[PDB]
Amino acid sequence: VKEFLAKAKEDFLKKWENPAQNTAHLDQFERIKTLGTGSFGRVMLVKHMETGNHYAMKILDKQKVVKLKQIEHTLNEKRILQAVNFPFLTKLEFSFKDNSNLYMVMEYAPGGEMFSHLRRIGRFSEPHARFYAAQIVLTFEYLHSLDLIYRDLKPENLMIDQQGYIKVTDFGFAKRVKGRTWTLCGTPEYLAPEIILSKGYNKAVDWWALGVLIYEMAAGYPPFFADQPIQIYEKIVSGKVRFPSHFSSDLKDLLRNLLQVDLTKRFGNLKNGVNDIKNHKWFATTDWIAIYQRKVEAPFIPKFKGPGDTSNFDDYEEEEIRVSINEKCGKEFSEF
């Protein structure tokens, strides 16, 4: 584990210090369908024509990125995503920019968003939730060792692959930080109390977010919800969580230690680190090496209608990929 991580950091740092750049071009891809939408961009299913491979292409409108003050955050995403390498992260295959847009081509996960299946099915059994949670635990162990904070864990950002395993995607708020950082970012339901209270925070906020995810996966709703974000933040800072009666003894206990406002007590943030989580009773049945190696049978496996099947994704209004004849925001995105 410690040896694997050391070698992993060696691989990462080389790519981190000399990022790949301009490794493709738009018209090497056939744009097939919009798989999802964001405030400054969208993700499309595309086919790489020279290989016939299907990919997910994140298209970011440079002007919109600038307007939402996400320049540095978008540079973080691309710089981190091109450097990392882990089974449960969507691999960044290519990146490039043109006059109007930034492009990040990643591995296509045809199983769709966890969000979709979690909402439809209602909730996951504890073994089902545990299976996904373990992959997140390992992914955060990997990311955090690289001094990376993830900062946007949620079902919407957890893609299911052909084998039913998780691919963490969307690194817009990912940041390589040693020490505290301060940006107010994330999704309201998943914000740690630190973030809400403007304290300045560290990777512990990812472990709190793990608590929210596990809860939501197992309960079918998150531990803090309301109609408006303000109401949600009040609940998060309150220091109170109720568990459904069907939650096991062990699960309740894992959640109390994950969803812990006290940093000195929050699991993942103690001297023993992520092993407080790994060695917890709720994870007793979990074979961590087996999960990393993907030799564990997935509780749910998506329907294989074929390559580039999008039936596990919702339908979004398709929209032009317009490329201006003038270069926009050249200086801002120079290093992309």
Binding site: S39, L68, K69, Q70, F115, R119, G122, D152, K154, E156, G172, F173, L184, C185, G186, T187, P188, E189, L191, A219, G220, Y221, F225, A226, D227, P229, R242, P244
Partner: peptide
Amino acid sequence: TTYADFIASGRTGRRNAIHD
């Protein structure tokens, strides 16, 4: 029930990130 309150809430759809 809590499930009923969630499903009746305006935040069962995809949740956007926050910023500033």
